[PDB]
Amino acid sequence: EDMAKIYGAVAAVSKNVNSSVTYEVKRGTHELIKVPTIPHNLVLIQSDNGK
Amino acid sequence: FALAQINADDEFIGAIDKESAEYLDEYATLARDISNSLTLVKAAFGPLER
Numbered sequence: 001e002d003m004a005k006i007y008g009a010v011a012a013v014s015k016n017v018n019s020s021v022t023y024e025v026k027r028g029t030h031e032l033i034k035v036p037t038i039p040h041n042l043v044l045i046q047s048d049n050g051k
Numbered sequence: 052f053a054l055a056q057i058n059a060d061d062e063f064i065g066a067i068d069k070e071s072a073e074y075l076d077e078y079a080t081l082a083r084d085i086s087n088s089l090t091l092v093k094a095a096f097g098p099l100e101r
Contacts, residue, residue: 002087010094 002083006087006091006094013095017060
């Protein structure tokens with residue numbers, strides 16, 4: 001029974017090793033909006049007689 | 052100045068014999084625990100570093 005206690009304690013230490021890590025790479029990334037219409041700024045001004 | 056002579060009663064003598072049995076068991080128990088702890092340290096822990 002004492003040996004079973006000792007062996008189990010050593011096994012727990014051996015299981016404390018770390019396998020790897022995982023993370024998400026997202027810094028520097030932004031979302032894009034979509035502009036539907038082209039912003040023209042032209043207006044036509046004409047005289048009443050059409051001259 | 053008032054030293055008292057020691058009287059070894061039969062009840063006292065038997066009490067010592069009971070203590071010898073309990074002392075012997077305690078020493079044997081301690082020896083087993085020390086041996087178990089020494090085995091555990093060697094298998095589980097290595098040396099320390101700065």
